[PDB]
């Protein structure tokens, strides 16, 4: 089990080739995580909006032991996995308070690597 409080943050690591749908409490002990590599298929298929939908659905379908009402989602990063994930959470329709972005916006910190030339 857990603390049994039905409010908790959801983080969506939407990568450029993957998604991770994790869900955790206010302190930060994770109650479940499920990614595109978690839900079966793996390779070039993972990181597509069907993987965001299935990974989000298989992520938050297992919080029915909690039955969280007051949801709040804190996504991160670029990729094709955001909008399908928000349509998945709104499909489950639980009390999504506010979604938000927490993406790392650097202030010219490190040099990003070589351009691809492909």
């Amino acid at each position: 089990s857990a603390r049994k409080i039905p409010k908790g943050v959801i983080h969506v690591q939407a990568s450029f080739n993957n998604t991770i749908v994790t869900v955790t409490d206010v302190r930060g002990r994770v109650v479940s995580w499920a990614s595109a590599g978690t839900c079966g298929f793996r390779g070039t298929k993972r990181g597509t909006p069907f993987a965001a939908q299935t990974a989000a659905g298989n992520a938050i379908r297992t919080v029915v032991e909690q039955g969280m009402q007051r949801a709040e989602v804190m996504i991160k990063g670029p990729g094709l996995g955001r909008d399908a994930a928000l349509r998945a959470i709104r499909r489950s329709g639980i009390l999504l308070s506010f979604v938000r972005d927490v993406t790392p916006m650097p202030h010219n910190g490190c040099r990003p690597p070589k351009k691809r030339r492909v």
Binding site: F41, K45, R46, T48, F50, A51
Partner: protein, 149 residues
């Protein structure tokens, strides 16, 4: 090229049905229309002999179980081939339905084409045989790749 002029489709010779006339045109091989006519109406007189319902009912109820709602169109973007499924239309599903039904009906041996089309037709009416399995193996491939669009 732009389009095809709209359509002209007549009904069945003796039952006045636009589906069964489509089926008698699809069983036609090189002009022998009286023989394809003969095969279809011997199949109907066979289907009155097997069960005791309307042949429109067992035929339409058969081809509802052959018609797919979605299929694989192996399309391309940037040189990259996605197996993305695109939702097929209705009368397209009719033509594919009696297509797989008829070609699969040209495999089950033993007797004349009336028994062959009858047997694969009732197998479509019961979810057995090969046409509805062909529906499944063309249906569980587009289901297998929904991670594209």
């Amino acid at each position: 090229r732009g389009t095809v002029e709209e359509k002209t489709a007549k009904s069945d010779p003796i039952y006045r049905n636009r589906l069964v006339n489509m089926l008698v045109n699809r069983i036609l091989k090189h002009g022998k229309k009286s023989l394809a006519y003969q095969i279809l109406y011997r199949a109907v007189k066979k289907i009155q002999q097997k069960t005791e319902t309307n042949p429109l009912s067992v035929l339409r109820q058969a081809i509802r179980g052959v018609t797919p709602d979605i299929a694989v169109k192996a399309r391309r973007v940037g040189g990259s081939t996605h197996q993305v499924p695109i939702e097929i239309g209705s009368t397209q599903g009719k033509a594919l339905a009696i297509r797989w039904l008829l070609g699969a009906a040209r495999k089950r041996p033993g007797r004349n084409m009336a028994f062959k089309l009858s047997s694969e037709l009732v197998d479509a009416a019961k979810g057995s045989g090969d046409a509805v399995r062909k529906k499944e193996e063309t249906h569980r491939m587009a289901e297998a790749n929904r991670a594209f669009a």
